[PDB]
Design a protein around this ligand. Structure first.
Ligand SMILES: Cc1nc(NNC(=O)[C@H](CC2CCCC2)CN(O)CO)c(F)c(N2CCN3CCOC[C@@H]3C2)n1
Ligand code: NI
Length: 191
C-alpha cells in the first residue's frame, strides 16, 4: 500500500508520490483515523511534514524536483485517511500535523487569496478567487490523541480549509466563481 512504502524509514516523499486529478482518490471522502494511532499513521504525519520542509528549502526543492507546499493532505498520497499537514512560514505562523481535523465554527465573511490557489495534485493553472470562510475554528487531534481547538484567520485559515477540502474530495477550483472568476462578491475579503 502507499502508506506502507511511504512510512519506510528510508522513504522521502517526492512529487512521484503525489497523485493528480483524474485519480478517483482525490474525489473520495477520506476515512477518520481511530485512536490510538498506529505507528504508521504517526510516521506518515511526520513524512508529510518533512515533505513540506523539503519543498520550502530552495536547495532540497530543486534537487528533489519538488513544487513548494504550505500544506498537504493524505489523499494526495493515495492514502484515504483524514490526516493533513500545514506549514505556513511567517519562524512559522502555523506548523501542525492534524488528525481528523474539523471546522466547528466559521465566519459569515468570506476570504480568498488575491493570487488565487494552486494544488500539488493539479498540473495546470486555474485562475480566479477561491472563495472560502474568512475565519474558522478547527478541532483536531495530535499524534498523542490530545484534542486541540484553534482559531484561524488570514492565510492560515485558507491553507487549512484547502487541506480539509482534500479529505472531503473537494478541489480548489470547485470554489471559483465560474461565471466571473475574479468577482468580488459582497462580504468577500481579498487577501
Ligand atoms: C499559497 C502558497 N501556495 C503554495 N503552494 N501550494 C500549496 O502549498 C498547496 C496548498 C495551498 C494552496 C492555497 C492554500 C493552500 C498544496 N496543496 O495542493 C495542498 O493540498 C506555496 F508553495 C506557497 N508558498 C509560500 C511559503 N513559501 C515559503 C518558502 O518556500 C516556498 C513557499 C511557497 N504559498
Ligand atoms: Ni491541494
Amino acid at each position: 500500500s502507499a502508506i506502507e512504502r511511504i512510512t519506510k524509514a528510508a522513504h522521502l516523499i517526492d512529487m512521484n508520490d503525489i497523485i493528480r486529478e483524474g485519480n478517483p482518490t482525490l474525489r473520495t471522502v477520506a476515512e477518520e483515523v481511530t485512536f490510538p494511532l498506529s505507528d504508521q499513521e504517526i510516521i506518515l504525519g511526520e513524512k508529510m511534514m518533512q515533505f513540506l520542509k523539503h519543498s520550502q528549502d530552495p536547495v532540497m526543492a530543486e534537487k528533489m524536483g519538488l513544487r513548494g507546499g504550505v500544506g498537504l493532505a493524505a489523499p494526495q498520497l493515495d492514502i484515504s485517511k483524514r490526516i493533513i499537514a500545514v506549514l505556513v512560514p511567517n519562524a512559522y505562523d502555523l506548523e501542525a500535523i492534524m488528525y481528523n481535523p474539523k471546522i466547528v465554527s466559521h465566519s459569515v465573511q468570506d476570504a480568498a487569496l488575491g493570487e488565487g490557489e494552486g494544488c500539488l495534485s493539479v498540473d495546470r493553472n486555474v485562475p480566479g478567487y477561491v472563495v472560502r470562510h474568512a475565519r474558522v475554528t478547527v478541532d483536531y487531534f495530535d499524534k498523542d490523541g490530545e484534542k486541540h481547538r484553534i482559531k484561524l484567520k488570514g492565510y492560515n485559515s485558507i491553507v487549512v480549509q484547502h487541506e480539509i477540502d482534500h479529505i472531503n474530495g473537494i478541489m480548489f477550483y470547485d470554489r471559483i466563481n465560474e461565471k466571473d472568476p475574479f468577482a468580488v462578491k459582497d462580504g468577500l475579503l481579498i487577501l
